[PDB]
Amino acid sequence: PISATMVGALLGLGTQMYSNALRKLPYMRHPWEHVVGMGLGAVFANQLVKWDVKLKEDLDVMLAKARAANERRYF
Amino acid sequence: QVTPSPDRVKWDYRGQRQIIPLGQWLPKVAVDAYVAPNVVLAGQVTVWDGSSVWNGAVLRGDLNKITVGFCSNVQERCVVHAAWS
Numbered sequence: 001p002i003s004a005t006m007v008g009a010l011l012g013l014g015t016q017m018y019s020n021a022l023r024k025l026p027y028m029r030h031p032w033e034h035v036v037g038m039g040l041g042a043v044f045a046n047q048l049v050k051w052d053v054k055l056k057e058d059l060d061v062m063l064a065k066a067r068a069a070n071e072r073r074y075f
Numbered sequence: 076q077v078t079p080s081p082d083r084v085k086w087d088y089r090g091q092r093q094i095i096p097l098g099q100w101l102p103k104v105a106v107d108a109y110v111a112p113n114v115v116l117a118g119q120v121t122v123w124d125g126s127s128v129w130n131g132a133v134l135r136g137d138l139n140k141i142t143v144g145f146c147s148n149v150q151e152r153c154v155v156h157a158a159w160s
């Protein structure tokens with residue numbers, strides 16, 4: 001379906017084209033750079049998803065400790 | 076008397092250079108401007124974004140500045156020159 005790899009590749013390709021356009025160059029001026037951008041975008045999107053999972057995992061434990069410290073009041 | 080030189084170039088394999096600098100006067104062409112291959116730009120010439128200079132035109136800025144503005148066109152075999160005053 002719509003995987004992080006595909007979203008990232010599309011974003012990387014879009015980044016290269018947007019960069020070319022901003023510089024008033026043809027969209028496909030250096031195509032190997034478009035390939036590089038697709039690769040980097042895919043890598044970055046996958047890494048972001050994994051980091052999001054890990055971040056939620058750490059926030060869970062930290063909220064657990066906060067809750068325990070708060071519950072110590074009613075002892 | 077007409078005394079020739081034996082070393083004068085009869086055939087130049089490079090053809091006519093499109094961009095002719097003149098000291099520090101270097102013609103400036105925008106990256107999104109079309110300049111036909113056989114056009115000659117010399118000296119103080121500025122060709123701006125979206126403009127176009129077509130086959131056989133000559134733009135010689137050796138006495139004053141020459142400017143082709145945004146989205147303007149100088150068409151085939153035009154000659155654009157300038158004077159001191």
Ligand SMILES: CCCCCCCCCCCCCCCCCCCC(=O)O[C@H](COC(=O)CCCCCCCCCCCCCC)COP(=O)(O)OCCN
Binds near residue numbers: 032033035036
């Ligand atoms: C697998 C597809 C993607 C692979 C990309 C290459 C491998 C990754 C290595 C890092 C690539 C990063 C991007 C390289 C270019 C960065 C920007 C350089 C542009 C620049 O200003 O300097 C140019 C140097 O050219 C250069 O830097 C390029 C030099 C030669 C690289 C081009 C060959 C890429 C091969 C693609 C697949 C080949 C298939 C067979 C293996 C000089 O610009 P200039 O005067 O030379 O001309 C340009 C005409 N506007």
